[PDB]
């Protein structure tokens, strides 16, 4: 989830 958020951002 951390990196999902990074990509989303
Ligand atoms: Mn990242």
Give DSSP secondary structure letters for 1-9.
Answer: -HHHHHHH-
For residue 9, how far is its CA from the centre of ligand 1 (angstroms)?
A: 10
Owner of token pair 């951002």: 9
Q: Write down the experimental method used for this entry.
A: X-ray
Owner of token pair 């990074």: 6
Most distant CA pair in the chain, distance: 12
For residue 4, how far is its CA from the centre of ligand 1 (angstroms)?
A: 8
Long-range contacts of 2-9 (CB under 8 A, 24+ apart): none
For residue 6, how far is its CA from the centre of ligand 1 (angstroms)?
A: 5
What's the resolution in A? 1.1
């Amino acid at each position: 989830l951390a990196e999902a958020l990074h990509s989303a951002l």
